Design an enzyme around this catalytic site. Structure first.
Site, PDB file in Angstrom:
ATOM      1  N   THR A 179      -0.951   2.384  -8.529  1.00 39.17           N
ATOM      2  CA  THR A 179      -2.011   3.091  -9.248  1.00 39.17           C
ATOM      3  C   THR A 179      -1.446   4.193 -10.138  1.00 39.17           C
ATOM      4  O   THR A 179      -1.828   4.310 -11.314  1.00 39.17           O
ATOM      5  CB  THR A 179      -3.069   3.614  -8.263  1.00 39.17           C
ATOM      6  OG1 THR A 179      -3.783   2.488  -7.738  1.00 39.17           O
ATOM      7  CG2 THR A 179      -4.057   4.586  -8.933  1.00 39.17           C
TER       8      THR A 179
ATOM      9  N   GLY B 227      -2.775  -3.227  -2.444  1.00 38.56           N
ATOM     10  CA  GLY B 227      -1.506  -3.830  -2.037  1.00 38.56           C
ATOM     11  C   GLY B 227      -1.433  -4.203  -0.569  1.00 38.56           C
ATOM     12  O   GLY B 227      -2.251  -3.767   0.245  1.00 38.56           O
TER      13      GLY B 227
ATOM     14  N   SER C  95       0.811  -1.200   0.000  1.00 38.45           N
ATOM     15  CA  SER C  95       0.000   0.000   0.000  1.00 38.45           C
ATOM     16  C   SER C  95       0.856   1.266   0.000  1.00 38.45           C
ATOM     17  O   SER C  95       1.757   1.426   0.834  1.00 38.45           O
ATOM     18  CB  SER C  95      -0.962  -0.006   1.189  1.00 38.45           C
ATOM     19  OG  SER C  95      -1.678   1.208   1.247  1.00 38.45           O
ATOM     20  N   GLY C  96       0.555   2.159  -0.943  1.00 39.60           N
ATOM     21  CA  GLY C  96       1.253   3.434  -1.078  1.00 39.60           C
ATOM     22  C   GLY C  96       2.552   3.388  -1.871  1.00 39.60           C
ATOM     23  O   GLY C  96       3.261   4.389  -1.939  1.00 39.60           O
TER      24      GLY C  96
ATOM     25  N   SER D 107      -5.757   5.610  -1.381  1.00 43.73           N
ATOM     26  CA  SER D 107      -5.736   4.150  -1.407  1.00 43.73           C
ATOM     27  C   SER D 107      -6.833   3.554  -2.296  1.00 43.73           C
ATOM     28  O   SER D 107      -8.005   3.919  -2.176  1.00 43.73           O
ATOM     29  CB  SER D 107      -5.856   3.598   0.020  1.00 43.73           C
ATOM     30  OG  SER D 107      -5.682   2.191   0.050  1.00 43.73           O
ATOM     31  N   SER D 108      -6.441   2.635  -3.178  1.00 47.12           N
ATOM     32  CA  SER D 108      -7.402   1.850  -3.969  1.00 47.12           C
ATOM     33  C   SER D 108      -8.048   0.794  -3.072  1.00 47.12           C
ATOM     34  O   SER D 108      -7.350  -0.062  -2.503  1.00 47.12           O
ATOM     35  CB  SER D 108      -6.713   1.143  -5.144  1.00 47.12           C
ATOM     36  OG  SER D 108      -5.912   2.023  -5.914  1.00 47.12           O
TER      37      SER D 108
ATOM     38  N   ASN E 237      -2.057   5.509   2.721  1.00 50.36           N
ATOM     39  CA  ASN E 237      -2.192   6.131   1.411  1.00 50.36           C
ATOM     40  C   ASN E 237      -3.436   7.010   1.372  1.00 50.36           C
ATOM     41  O   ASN E 237      -4.560   6.521   1.529  1.00 50.36           O
ATOM     42  CB  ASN E 237      -2.275   5.039   0.329  1.00 50.36           C
ATOM     43  CG  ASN E 237      -2.232   5.590  -1.089  1.00 50.36           C
ATOM     44  OD1 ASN E 237      -2.261   6.801  -1.312  1.00 50.36           O
ATOM     45  ND2 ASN E 237      -2.188   4.678  -2.066  1.00 50.36           N
TER      46      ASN E 237
ATOM     47  N   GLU F  25      -1.032  -4.525   3.185  1.00 50.60           N
ATOM     48  CA  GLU F  25      -1.205  -3.470   4.187  1.00 50.60           C
ATOM     49  C   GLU F  25      -1.413  -4.060   5.574  1.00 50.60           C
ATOM     50  O   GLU F  25      -1.952  -5.159   5.715  1.00 50.60           O
ATOM     51  CB  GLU F  25      -2.382  -2.541   3.811  1.00 50.60           C
ATOM     52  CG  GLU F  25      -3.778  -3.211   3.799  1.00 50.60           C
ATOM     53  CD  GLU F  25      -4.929  -2.222   3.556  1.00 50.60           C
ATOM     54  OE1 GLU F  25      -6.033  -2.426   4.123  1.00 50.60           O
ATOM     55  OE2 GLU F  25      -4.734  -1.242   2.809  1.00 50.60           O
TER      56      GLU F  25
HETATM   57  N1  ADP Z   1       5.573   8.387  -9.984  1.00 45.44           N
HETATM   58  C1  ADP Z   1       5.018   9.189  -9.043  1.00 45.44           C
HETATM   59  N2  ADP Z   1       5.116  10.539  -9.122  1.00 45.44           N
HETATM   60  C2  ADP Z   1       4.572  11.358  -8.201  1.00 45.44           C
HETATM   61  N3  ADP Z   1       3.894  10.920  -7.127  1.00 45.44           N
HETATM   62  C3  ADP Z   1       3.720   9.586  -6.925  1.00 45.44           C
HETATM   63  C4  ADP Z   1       4.282   8.624  -7.889  1.00 45.44           C
HETATM   64  N4  ADP Z   1       3.963   7.394  -7.451  1.00 45.44           N
HETATM   65  C5  ADP Z   1       3.253   7.559  -6.305  1.00 45.44           C
HETATM   66  N5  ADP Z   1       3.100   8.864  -6.001  1.00 45.44           N
HETATM   67  C6  ADP Z   1       2.441   9.420  -4.792  1.00 45.44           C
HETATM   68  O1  ADP Z   1       2.211   8.339  -3.878  1.00 45.44           O
HETATM   69  C7  ADP Z   1       0.816   8.227  -3.618  1.00 45.44           C
HETATM   70  C8  ADP Z   1       0.462   6.750  -3.515  1.00 45.44           C
HETATM   71  O2  ADP Z   1       0.639   6.173  -4.802  1.00 45.44           O
HETATM   72  P1  ADP Z   1      -0.403   5.076  -5.347  1.00 45.44           P
HETATM   73  O3  ADP Z   1      -0.053   4.753  -6.769  1.00 45.44           O
HETATM   74  O4  ADP Z   1      -1.800   5.545  -5.014  1.00 45.44           O
HETATM   75  O5  ADP Z   1      -0.079   3.827  -4.374  1.00 45.44           O
HETATM   76  P2  ADP Z   1      -0.685   2.326  -4.502  1.00 45.44           P
HETATM   77  O6  ADP Z   1       0.548   1.476  -4.711  1.00 45.44           O
HETATM   78  O7  ADP Z   1      -1.334   2.081  -3.173  1.00 45.44           O
HETATM   79  O8  ADP Z   1      -1.667   2.310  -5.656  1.00 45.44           O
HETATM   80  C9  ADP Z   1       0.157   8.966  -4.775  1.00 45.44           C
HETATM   81  O9  ADP Z   1      -1.157   9.440  -4.464  1.00 45.44           O
HETATM   82  C10 ADP Z   1       1.117  10.103  -5.059  1.00 45.44           C
HETATM   83  O10 ADP Z   1       0.983  11.124  -4.053  1.00 45.44           O
HETATM   84  O1  VO4 Z   2      -2.821   2.041  -0.934  1.00 46.90           O
HETATM   85  V1  VO4 Z   2      -3.035   0.963  -2.460  1.00 46.90           V
HETATM   86  O2  VO4 Z   2      -1.955  -0.575  -2.659  1.00 46.90           O
HETATM   87  O3  VO4 Z   2      -4.543  -0.033  -1.778  1.00 46.90           O
HETATM   88  O4  VO4 Z   2      -3.928   1.662  -3.951  1.00 46.90           O
HETATM   89 MG    MG Z   3      -3.708   2.064  -5.682  1.00 48.62          MG
END
Ligand code: ADP
Ligand code: VO4
Ligand code: MG
Length: 747
Positions: free
Chosen positions: A150, A434, A145-146, A189-190, A186, A436
């Site tokens: 996404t 992911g 997570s985070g 978070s998805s 996050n 968590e």
């Molecule tokens: N390549 C990137 N560039 C800028 N910010 C990022 C990037 N990847 C992640 N982030 C930051 O980290 C946060 C969490 O990323 P996200 O893709 O939502 O995590 P997850 O793996 O849970 O889907 C995002 O909302 C953004 O603030």
């Molecule tokens: O914080 V995430 O792996 O559920 O999108």
């Molecule tokens: Mg996500």
């Protein structure tokens, strides 16, 4: 020469070996510390340089891997290869220019290694493989997570649609509004999984798309922890809706709603956007503590952006208002309260205070007020009165089913924006919730972590097992790399009859279901199992007082997690009583109608859906992006060495790097290669063994003997030789003739 030795927070530190003992090396960081001989690794001679592919390091080991990623991260290079697998470390800020349209163009048709490491290169490689191999492709974006799954999914989708096609991209704010939420790990978070397929024709041009969605977190609809929020849409709507919409939907500040007010009721906003939110939308908590801070999220701005997105992709204003209406209907539903009736019915009545909530909910959901009242407080089973707790459950069950079906509609509506009649192949991108864990872990975490186990197993199977089986079958003599497999953890969870999910199902079906009975059964039926423990054996103090029948520890591939089992039985039941289903299915509102023992297993839904997904993945060529979370504070330029090392280990990246010391990521049948070039060949090479033409071709292309190896049927190429491999593989008549002419000149 400097070496790498253990450091408790950095993972490894630089030092010199000054002495040696029976079980130790003495490391000088006058000061000394002891390290085990096997915990000390050679270091790269230049500590300031970095390499784009970890396979290019002089010494391939976990310490040099960690350092290389660290150096790159410090230069805002978040992407690094291990051959054809991409590592992406979350920057937690927007790095200028790296996702621009100019950058997108620069990656088109470029072999791996001919451009700096990038998600775009993985996307282009998938496209190339789809074209060359005539095989649909999957891009698996993994991580806790985070970590950035996404975000990277969105980059891949943007790259492919911009290069080889936009509505697929534009629809994203809609999905995130309904399926994403603030958790402590996050802000965005998805709370659902997705597999997004981009479909192509015979000319390899985009014809449309399809989003498969999985396992929305239903509990969040009704309750959240104080640091967390419900789905974004609730806050976007409350912050951003016009006064006309607010009035029609009877909306107010989030603290006025039970389904929002146990959670954090603050908006994401900055100085500027706070001024755009009307006073009557702000909760006491927001007025006292101020806004939540994020580089990406802003409730008011995101409402506007979402509405723009809806319009661009073809949703009309009626559709938009329908969506908002159901959201508000769910909110008012949650505000309905019940009280003891006493000896009149023996059941419950709606509180007098709840009259407005009943009126508003009924209006918005197209229901008769009395029908709703009766359905929430009675059940035909004889029409029997419900107790207060059962009424609470009826209300919440209806709320969850309404919102869940609304989400189903949203995903379907999105798919309707980019429909296609037929396609040749697809490239699919997988983005799950992911791994968590929190201070208190429940069934939601158990299910999420189980899915992550399953996905890691797919990686292990495809990359660590099948890769080595191929080398073996081809007689390559590649040193075997052993690794810890996680199938035993999967079996603990999903095994027929004896697995945790089936034991839970069994509990739901007993005369008097009990979380404690279920938990006792899990421990009893899994005596001595390596992947299961009791809470009192936890590494963390917070878990030490949980009783044996109140929780269990699962030794996940990504770390032990202690689960409290209270509510596991209730959370495992997805069933909706027919009384409530009938009520909503017979709504007077067309839109709401079109959204649509008493026990349905939630766990069996996790298993069945994942297995269907895994079937689809197994039929495709797979590419992998390993997202890494740099710290637990959502901060930029804070590389937590030990934390990152742990991820590199449990993700299997250290094992893969080990295998790559002598592995071969590229290969083709040498008979098929010969067959392809045959019509252009001069007699002098045509007459010789097919491997001899291949050798001549390789040498003419500047490949050295160490770069390739002939197996029994296939020729294999080392990392860093993707460019040459891609050239060899081109089946275009002009290009085949070109290379043969080069061979002729070389001879
Ligand atoms: N390549 C990137 N560039 C800028 N910010 C990022 C990037 N990847 C992640 N982030 C930051 O980290 C946060 C969490 O990323 P996200 O893709 O939502 O995590 P997850 O793996 O849970 O889907 C995002 O909302 C953004 O603030
Ligand atoms: O914080 V995430 O792996 O559920 O999108
Ligand atoms: Mg996500």
């Amino acid at each position: 020469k400097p070496v790498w030795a253990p450091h408790p927070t950095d993972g490894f530190q630089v030092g010199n070996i000054v002495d040696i003992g029976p079980d130790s090396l003495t490391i000088e960081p006058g000061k000394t510390f002891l390290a085990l001989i096997n915990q000390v690794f050679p270091a790269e001679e230049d500590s300031k340089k970095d390499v784009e592919d970890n396979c290019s390091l002089m010494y391939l080991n976990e310490a040099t891997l960690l350092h290389n990623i660290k150096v790159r991260y410090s230069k805002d290079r978040i992407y690094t290869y291990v051959a054809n697998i991409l590592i992406a470390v979350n920057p937690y800020f927007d790095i200028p220019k790296i996702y621009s349209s100019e950058t997108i163009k620069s990656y088109q048709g470029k072999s791996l290694g001919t451009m700096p490491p990038h998600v775009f290169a993985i996307a282009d490689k998938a496209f190339r493989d789809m074209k060359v191999l005539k095989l649909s492709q999957s891009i698996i974006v993994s991580g806790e997570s985070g970590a950035g799954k996404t975000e990277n999914t969105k980059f891949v989708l943007r790259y492919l649609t911009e290069s080889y096609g936009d509505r697929i991209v534009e629809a994203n704010p809609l999905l995130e509004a309904f399926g994403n939420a603030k958790t402590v790990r996050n802000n965005n978070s998805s709370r659902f999984g997705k597999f997004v397929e981009i479909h192509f024709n015979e000319k390899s041009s985009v014809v449309g798309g399809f989003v498969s969605h999985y396992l929305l977190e239903k509990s969040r609809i009704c309750v959240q922890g104080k640091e967390e929020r419900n789905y974004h849409i609730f806050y976007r709507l409350c912050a951003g809706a016009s006064e006309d919409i607010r009035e029609r939907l009877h909306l107010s500040s989030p603290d006025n709603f039970r389904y929002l007010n146990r959670g954090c009721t603050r908006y994401f906003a900055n100085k500027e956007t706070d001024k755009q939110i009307l006073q009557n939308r702000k909760s006491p908590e927001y007025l006292k503590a101020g806004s939540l801070k994020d580089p990406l999220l802003d409730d008011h701005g995101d409402f506007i952006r979402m509405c723009t997105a809806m319009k661009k992709i073809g949703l009309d204003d009626e559709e938009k208002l329908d969506l908002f209406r159901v959201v508000a209907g769910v909110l008012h539903l949650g505000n309905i309260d019940f009280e003891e009736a006493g000896s009149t019915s023996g059941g419950c009545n709606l509180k007098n205070k709840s009259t407005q909530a009943l009126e508003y909910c009924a209006e918005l959901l197209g229901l008769d007020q009395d029908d709703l009242r009766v359905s929430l407080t009675t059940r035909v089973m004889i029409k029997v009165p419900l107790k207060v707790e059962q009424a609470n459950n009826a209300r919440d069950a209806l709320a969850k089913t309404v919102y869940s079906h609304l989400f189903d509609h949203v995903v379907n509506r999105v798919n309707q924006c980019f429909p296609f009649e037929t396609s040749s192949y697809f490239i699919g991108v997988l983005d799950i919730a992911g791994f968590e864990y929190f201070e208190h872990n429940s069934f939601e975490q158990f299910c999420i972590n189980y899915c992550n186990e399953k996905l890691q197993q797919f990686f292990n199977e495809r990359i660590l097992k099948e890769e080595q089986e191929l080398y073996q079958k081809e007689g390559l003599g590649v040193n075997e790399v052993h690794y810890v497999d996680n199938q035993d953890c999967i079996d603990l969870i999903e095994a027929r009859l004896v697995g945790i999910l089936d034991i839970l199902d069994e509990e739901n079906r007993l005369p008097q279901p009990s979380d404690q009975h279920f938990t006792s059964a899990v421990h009893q039926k899994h005596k001595d199992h390596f992947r299961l423990s009791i809470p009192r054996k936890s590494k963390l103090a917070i878990h030490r007082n949980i009783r044996d029948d109140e929780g269990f520890i699962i030794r996940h591939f990504a770390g032990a997690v202690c689960y409290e089992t209270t509510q596991f039985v209730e959370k495992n039941n997805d069933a909706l009583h027919m009384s409530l289903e009938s009520l909503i299915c017979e709504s007077r509102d067309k839109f709401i109608r079109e959204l649509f023992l008493s026990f349905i297993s939630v766990g069996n839904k996790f298993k069945t859906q994942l297995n269907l997904l895994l079937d689809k993945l197994r039929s495709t060529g797979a590419s992998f992006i390993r997202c890494i979370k740099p710290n637990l504070k959502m901060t930029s330029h804070h590389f937590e060495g030990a934390q990152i090392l742990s991820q590199l280990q449990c993700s299997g990246m250290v094992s893969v790097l080990d295998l790559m010391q002598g592995g071969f990521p590229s290969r083709a049948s040498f008979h098929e290669l010969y067959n392809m070039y045959k019509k252009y060949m001069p007699d002098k090479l045509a007459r010789l063994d097919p491997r001899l033409f291949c050798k001549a071709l390789f040498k003419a292309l500047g490949l050295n003997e160490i770069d390739y190896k002939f197996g029994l049927t296939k020729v294999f190429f080392r990392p860093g030789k993707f460019a040459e491999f891609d050239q060899i593989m081109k089946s275009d008549p002009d290009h085949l003739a070109e290379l043969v002419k080069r061979v002729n000149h070389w001879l």
